[PDB]
Amino acid sequence: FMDIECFMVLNPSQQLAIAVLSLTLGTFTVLENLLVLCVILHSRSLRCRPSYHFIGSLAVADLLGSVIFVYSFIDFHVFHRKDSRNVFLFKLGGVTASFTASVGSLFLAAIDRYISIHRPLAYKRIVTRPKAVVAFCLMWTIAIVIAVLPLLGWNCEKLQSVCSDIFPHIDKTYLMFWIGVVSVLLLFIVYAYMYILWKAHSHAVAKALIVYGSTTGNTEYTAETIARELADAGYEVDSRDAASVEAGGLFEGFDLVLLGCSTWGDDSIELQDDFIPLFDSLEETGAQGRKVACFGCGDSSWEYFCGAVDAIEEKLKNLGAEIVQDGLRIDGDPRAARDDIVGWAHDVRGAIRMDIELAKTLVLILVVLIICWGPLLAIMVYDVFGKMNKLIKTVFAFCSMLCLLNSTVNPIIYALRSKDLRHAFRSMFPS
Numbered sequence: 001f002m003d004i005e006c007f008m009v010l011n012p013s014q015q016l017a018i019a020v021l022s023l024t025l026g027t028f029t030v031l032e033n034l035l036v037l038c039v040i041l042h043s044r045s046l047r048c049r050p051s052y053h054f055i056g057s058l059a060v061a062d063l064l065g066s067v068i069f070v071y072s073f074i075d076f077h078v079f080h081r082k083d084s085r086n087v088f089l090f091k092l093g094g095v096t097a098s099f100t101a102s103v104g105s106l107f108l109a110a111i112d113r114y115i116s117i118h119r120p121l122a123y124k125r126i127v128t129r130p131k132a133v134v135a136f137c138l139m140w141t142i143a144i145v146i147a148v149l150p151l152l153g154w155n156c157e158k159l160q161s162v163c164s165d166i167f168p169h170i171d172k173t174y175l176m177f178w179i180g181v182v183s184v185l186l187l188f189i190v191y192a193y194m195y196i197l198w199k200a201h202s203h204a205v206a207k208a209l210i211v212y213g214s215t216t217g218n219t220e221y222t223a224e225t226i227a228r229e230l231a232d233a234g235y236e237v238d239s240r241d242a243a244s245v246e247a248g249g250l251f252e253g254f255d256l257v258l259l260g261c262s263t264w265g266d267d268s269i270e271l272q273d274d275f276i277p278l279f280d281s282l283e284e285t286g287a288q289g290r291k292v293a294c295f296g297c298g299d300s301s302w303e304y305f306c307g308a309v310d311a312i313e314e315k316l317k318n319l320g321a322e323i324v325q326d327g328l329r330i331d332g333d334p335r336a337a338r339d340d341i342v343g344w345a346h347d348v349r350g351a352i353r354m355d356i357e358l359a360k361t362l363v364l365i366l367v368v369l370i371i372c373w374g375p376l377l378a379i380m381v382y383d384v385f386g387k388m389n390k391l392i393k394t395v396f397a398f399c400s401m402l403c404l405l406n407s408t409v410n411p412i413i414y415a416l417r418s419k420d421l422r423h424a425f426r427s428m429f430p431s
């Protein structure tokens with residue numbers, strides 16, 4: 001038993017600001033989605049290839065949600081309308097389902113693009129047109145079912161219950177359940193997109209592994225000269241002396257692997273004593289379908305010029321490691337052959353990032369969702385655990401406007417970014 005006017009914290013100036021922000025964004029949001037829906041149906045008449053299952057659901061939810069929200073919000077605040085419990089829970093159920101289905105659409109958009117990254121080869125087997133058709137339908141029914149529950153029962157007046165100080169006639173247990181399901185998909189949305197950016201961050205920069213024997217220090221100076229062209233180009237480098245290497249999984253996670261070794265053949269071809277242990281235990285090395293290249297120092301005076309490079313390349317192509325370019329072979333000092341070093345290093349780089357606008361969009365969406373749903377659900381958690389003062393009700397009233405802004409910026413985030421929709425919008429014009 002709570003007074004309806006107790007939920008109405010309304011300063012005539014605060015009432016005008018509420019009305020201004022809600023009638024601008026409201027009329028602006030409705031016109032946006034009413035245009036988006038018109039474009040899809042116009043596009044449906046011309047092209048049957050774009051699914052438009054996600055953008056249509058998001059637009060319908062934002063249109064229906066905003067229309068009922070702005071009207072009820074202004075009627076409740078500016079006009080101070082006192083409705084019966086069922087008539088209010090009918091209206092509150094309507095907006096809640098629409099906004100729930102809206103964020104449920106973003107949840108289905110998250111799983112659509114999460115499966116494409118986690119399981120690219122199996123994406124076409126899971127996400128289909130009938131499955132997405134059924135999923136959205138069930139997403140809408142569940143969204144309606146949950147939001148109709150307060151009207152059916154499970155409210156603060158039907159049961160001896162502890163009520164909400166921001167939503168009249170609502171049981172806090174129902175809100176905690178509603179917050180839970182909304183928070184789970186939101187956290188999954190945040191987790192998925194954060195999982196996309198961290199996964200794409202490792203692929204942007206390539207990793208190059210350099211090992212060398214070099215008793216005298218020439219193949220090291222070579223590798224040190226080899227590494228800088230790679231490093232200056234933008235390659236993560238992990239040069240390692242062959243005397244301090246671990247055999248098993250030595251090449252794991254390297255897009256390119258450069259194996260340099262000096263030849264030390266007094267009588268017969270012999271490699272660097274430090275490079276021999278790694279040579280023997282190569283099978284242990286990943287040694288498979290790994291882009292790899294060789295280099296090494298030698299001298300013309302010997303019958304086997306850089307025979308080490310030949311022995312290594314024979315084991316690499318034996319196990320199937322793709323040798324992208326021939327091994328680099330140097331005699332004497334590589335300080336005079338610096339040009340050929342950076343030449344072979346730029347060539348092995350030639351023979352072989354991410355969409356930042358799509359990467360920033362995820363950042364933007366995450367920043368948007370954290371901005372629009374963070375404080376909104378936060379105030380509701382304050383209502384569930386303990387209670388709040390009058391200022392928080394006023395802040396929540398302004399924060400109730402914050403989710404409406406999300407419905408305004410969504411057709412700019414997704415529909416405007418749709419290359420197919422913009423084609424359908426231009427097709428509206430003569431030719």
Ligand SMILES: Cc1cc2nc3c(=O)[nH]c(=O)nc-3n(C[C@H](O)[C@H](O)[C@H](O)COP(=O)(O)O)c2cc1C
Pocket residue numbers: 213214215216217218219220261262263264265266268269270297298299300302303304305306307331332333
């Ligand atoms: C005992 C001995 C054997 C060598 N055998 C070879 C050989 O078979 N083939 C070759 O090209 N150079 C051979 N060299 C020359 C070295 O490979 C050359 O000095 C090289 O620049 C050494 O590289 P590092 O400074 O990276 O150890 C040999 C040198 C010595 C002292």
Ligand SMILES: CC(C)CCC[C@@H](C)[C@H]1CC[C@H]2[C@@H]3CC=C4C[C@@H](O)CC[C@]4(C)[C@H]3CC[C@]12C
Pocket residue numbers: 052053054056057060064093094097098136137140141144
């Ligand atoms: C929210 C309450 C008050 C009324 C909802 C009833 C109507 C408007 C709801 C219930 C079922 C919903 C449909 C369920 C399935 C989809 C597929 C989706 O890809 C586009 C939206 C669309 C076509 C929904 C449009 C809106 C819809 C028809």
